[PDB]
Amino acid sequence: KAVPDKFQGFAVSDPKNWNRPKLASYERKQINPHDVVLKNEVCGLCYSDIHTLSAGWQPLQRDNLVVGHEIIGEVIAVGDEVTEFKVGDRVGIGAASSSCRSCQRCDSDNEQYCKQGAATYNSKDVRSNNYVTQGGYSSHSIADEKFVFAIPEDLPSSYGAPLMCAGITVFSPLIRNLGLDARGKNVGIIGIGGLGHLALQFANAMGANVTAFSRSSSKKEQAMKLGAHDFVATGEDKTWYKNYDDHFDFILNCASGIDGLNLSEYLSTLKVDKKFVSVGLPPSEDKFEVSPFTFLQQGASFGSSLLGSKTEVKEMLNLAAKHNVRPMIEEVPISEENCAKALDRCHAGDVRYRFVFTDFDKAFA
Amino acid sequence: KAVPDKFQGFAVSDPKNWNRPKLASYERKQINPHDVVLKNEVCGLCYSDIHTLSAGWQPLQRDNLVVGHEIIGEVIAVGDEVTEFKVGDRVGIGAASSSCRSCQRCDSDNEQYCKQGAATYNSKDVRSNNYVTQGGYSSHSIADEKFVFAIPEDLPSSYGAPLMCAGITVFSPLIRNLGLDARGKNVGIIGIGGLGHLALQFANAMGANVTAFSRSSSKKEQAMKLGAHDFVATGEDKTWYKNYDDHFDFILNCASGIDGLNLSEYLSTLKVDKKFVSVGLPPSEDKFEVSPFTFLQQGASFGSSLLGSKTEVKEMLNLAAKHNVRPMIEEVPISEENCAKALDRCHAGDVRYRFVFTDFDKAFA
Numbered sequence: 002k003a004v005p006d007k008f009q010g011f012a013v014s015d016p017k018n019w020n021r022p023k024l025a026s027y028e029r030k031q032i033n034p035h036d037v038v039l040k041n042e043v044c045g046l047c048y049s050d051i052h053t054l055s056a057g058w059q060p061l062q063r064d065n066l067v068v069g070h071e072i073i074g075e076v077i078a079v080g081d082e083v084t085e086f087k088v089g090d091r092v093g094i095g096a097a098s099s100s101c102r103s104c105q106r107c108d109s110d111n112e113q114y115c116k117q118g119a120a121t122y123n124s125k126d127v128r129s130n131n132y133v134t135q136g137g138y139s140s141h142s143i144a145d146e147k148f149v150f151a152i153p154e155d156l157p158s159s160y161g162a163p164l165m166c167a168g169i170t171v172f173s174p175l176i177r178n179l180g181l182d183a184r185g186k187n188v189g190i191i192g193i194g195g196l197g198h199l200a201l202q203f204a205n206a207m208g209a210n211v212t213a214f215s216r217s218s219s220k221k222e223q224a225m226k227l228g229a230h231d232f233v234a235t236g237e238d239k240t241w242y243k244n245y246d247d248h249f250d251f252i253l254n255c256a257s258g259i260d261g262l263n264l265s266e267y268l269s270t271l272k273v274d275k276k277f278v279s280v281g282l283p284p285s286e287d288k289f290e291v292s293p294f295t296f297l298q299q300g301a302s303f304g305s306s307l308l309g310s311k312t313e314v315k316e317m318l319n320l321a322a323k324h325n326v327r328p329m330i331e332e333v334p335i336s337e338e339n340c341a342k343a344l345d346r347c348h349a350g351d352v353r354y355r356f357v358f359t360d361f362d363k364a365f366a
Numbered sequence: 367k368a369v370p371d372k373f374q375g376f377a378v379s380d381p382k383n384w385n386r387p388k389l390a391s392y393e394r395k396q397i398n399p400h401d402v403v404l405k406n407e408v409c410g411l412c413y414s415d416i417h418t419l420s421a422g423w424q425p426l427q428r429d430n431l432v433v434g435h436e437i438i439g440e441v442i443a444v445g446d447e448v449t450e451f452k453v454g455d456r457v458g459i460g461a462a463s464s465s466c467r468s469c470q471r472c473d474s475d476n477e478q479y480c481k482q483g484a485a486t487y488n489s490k491d492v493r494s495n496n497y498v499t500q501g502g503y504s505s506h507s508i509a510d511e512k513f514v515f516a517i518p519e520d521l522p523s524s525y526g527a528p529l530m531c532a533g534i535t536v537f538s539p540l541i542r543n544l545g546l547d548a549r550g551k552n553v554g555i556i557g558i559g560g561l562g563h564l565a566l567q568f569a570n571a572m573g574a575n576v577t578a579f580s581r582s583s584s585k586k587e588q589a590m591k592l593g594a595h596d597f598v599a600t601g602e603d604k605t606w607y608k609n610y611d612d613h614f615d616f617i618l619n620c621a622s623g624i625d626g627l628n629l630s631e632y633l634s635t636l637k638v639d640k641k642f643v644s645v646g647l648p649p650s651e652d653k654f655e656v657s658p659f660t661f662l663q664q665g666a667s668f669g670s671s672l673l674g675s676k677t678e679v680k681e682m683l684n685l686a687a688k689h690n691v692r693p694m695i696e697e698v699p700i701s702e703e704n705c706a707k708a709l710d711r712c713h714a715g716d717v718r719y720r721f722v723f724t725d726f727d728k729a730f731a
């Protein structure tokens with residue numbers, strides 16, 4: 002009665018039908034002693050959802066897979082061991098949903114890097130009898146309390162939602178590599194989508210000197226408004242990197258692909274011993290290419306970063322409220338039709354800058 | 367009259383004869399205000415000498431090329447603006463010999479990364495009328511003051527010479543990534559050869575917990591003698607990484623072939639947000655693919671390091687003195703025959719662990 006045995010969600014079984022999710026009922030994950038159960042209110046559309054649904058990284062790990070991992074909802078139940086939340090709290094869930102609670106990472110604000118971590122969707126939870134996790138395009142969500150985040154009362158759910166993944170995912174590497182105060186440091190942000198448009202704002206808020214990089218200049222005016230001090234359209238200014246020798250303290254890639262992205266040219270603009278970090282994750286088949294030479298010129302490193310920690314989520318929300326960092330969203334009532342539309346438009350790149358699904362009651366009640 | 371108009375060296379003009387250098391005379395570089403002129407005493411045999419002589423990655427940039435860049439010698443002359451060295455001083459030269467003196471990198475302990483820098487051999491020196499630089503298999507050497515290092519009296523020349531390249535090449539990434547006091551830190555050193563044998567000793571001297579890696583156990587007893595605290599034979603213990611979860615603060619690849627490395631195994635043993643760095647690899651311009659997924663689970667990074675700074679060299683030498691860090695060398699009177707024998711063996715891996723050419727007074731007029 003409090004929690005139904007089955008949840009409802011918009012689901013896909015075949016990657017050929019990645020853009021045609023359909024209403025499905027499915028057995029819920031067990032509620033473990035540290036678990037929190039939400040009645041979902043909103044969910045953002047992350048390009049990770051599309052990569053997952055299209056099997057561009059790996060095959061779908063279950064039938065009727067429900068994606069979505071920028072979730073805001075209300076607590077309707079908690080396990081007996083939950084200490085951090087109570088029924089009626091409005092909270093958020095991002096891209097990871099549980100960890101082992103018994104490793105050093107779990108106890109030192111690296112729980113998103115737990116070796117036995119379970120993603121919010123498409124992932125086997127070994128703590129829940131190998132339940133393959135179900136996401137947030139759904140009436141309800143379950144996550145371990147370490148992966149459920151308090152939402153400030155003044156942040157409306159729709160704007161709060163993309164911060165649960167896009168936000169924390171770009172905030173984590175910026176604070177880790179630049180410090181909270183990034184004054185004097187130059188930061189490049191590649192790929193001005195969901196993640197990138199938030200990275201511009203967060204980097205600007207930290208005091209950094211921000212260069213926005215995009216394949217074209219169509220997003221220039223908005224990027225400038227979002228906190229970029231500098232804009233480069235790499236498809237138009239083909240030799241841009243020649244003016245940026247020894248310039249960047251850090252480069253953060255937020256692009257969904259490898260299409261217009263010459264990694265060597267980016268590395269050539271880093272200062273000595275600085276990092277290029279890709280939070281962007283193209284399909285598994287697609288890679289960047291780059292010679293030992295250009296690594297050698299700079300002592301530059303290439304790497305990636307995954308999500309962020311709960312400590313970091315709290316810091317990020319504080320900073321966001323402080324400097325008015327908010328995602329630019331387009332709200333869409335959840336439905337088979339609207340999810341199809343929104344997935345297709347997101348794939349087409351037609352969005353400024355994040356779709357957020359809303360009005361869950363009309364769908365699931 | 368102080369400096370001879372011509373120097374003598376064992377030189378090659380055809381990469382087909384990479385391993386059979388012949389005595390030859392050549393006009394010296396002009397002596398610039400910050401230049402230092404050495405009468406050479408010893409020169410270590412570095413593997414990059416074989417890379418260069420064989421032209422495997424870059425063609426010979428002059429006729430009668432003289433390689434060798436692990437030089438110890440005695441100052442016979444200085445340009446009018448030198449202040450740090452006086453005639454009679456016993457000094458050393460590594461793999462870079464000059465830099466622009468007018469960029470941030472030169473200004474800030476990164477002169478080895480100067481964009482207009484000149485290698486100790488086979489490099490056009492834009493400051494010296496495009497003279498193609500000549501190395502230390504020779505009677506004399508000329509280098510810029512910032513690339514000439516004072517040798518402490520307690521360091522014999524033959525033992526000091528490999529510190530000028532191998533030593534700094536491995537010490538720089540250690541100090542840059544572990545800090546100079548690396549107590550409590552775990553470091554992995556891959557490839558126990560010319561470079562790795564010094565890397566073990568430096569890492570141990572800095573206070574680190576050192577794991578030595580090689581394909582077989584053949585170098586294990588030696589690695590243990592050189593400062594390794596434990597050893598992994600990756601061809602014998604194929605699942606070794608299972609016992610090193612979340613272990614390493616840094617991993618340094620000491621010229622082990624990246625193709626022959628299973629990078630993913632090493633990366634899976636790093637702590638969060640750490641680096642796998644490679645040194646001593648040929649500066650090939652051939653591309654190779656990189657994927658963010660390779661690094662994602664650890665927030666890891668991959669990159670390179672090139673030589674090191676004079677500041678770092680000074681620290682390295684003090685450390686070597688305090689802790690008795692010293693290469694294991696096989697001394698070889700310089701001659702055509704001995705150069706051939708040593709080049710052949712060094713190419714083979716058949717040296718324990720560095721050849722040092724000696725007795726220059728008998729070879730040279």
Ligand SMILES: NC(=O)C1=CN([C@@H]2O[C@H](COP(=O)(O)OP(=O)(O)OC[C@H]3O[C@@H](n4cnc5c(N)ncnc54)[C@H](OP(=O)(O)O)[C@@H]3O)[C@@H](O)[C@H]2O)C=CC1
Nearest residue numbers: 048192193194195196215216256257258259260282307308
């Ligand atoms: N590391 C992590 O933990 C997380 C990673 N991600 C990943 O981050 C990436 C971005 O996600 P999100 O911001 O939602 O995606 P969006 O589609 O919202 O934005 C992606 C941006 O990439 C650029 N782009 C689009 N197609 C290509 C292509 N073929 N090649 C290169 N660039 C392209 C566009 O920027 P422009 O028009 O400026 O060129 C676009 O705005 C995805 O790969 C996603 O899987 C997401 C969440 C977390």
Ligand SMILES: [Mg+2]
Nearest residue numbers: 445446447448
């Ligand atoms: Mg003077």
Ligand SMILES: [Zn+2]
Nearest residue numbers: 049050096120
């Ligand atoms: Zn993801």
Ligand SMILES: [Zn+2]
Nearest residue numbers: 101104107115
């Ligand atoms: Zn854990």
Ligand SMILES: [Zn+2]
Nearest residue numbers: 466469472480
């Ligand atoms: Zn310079």
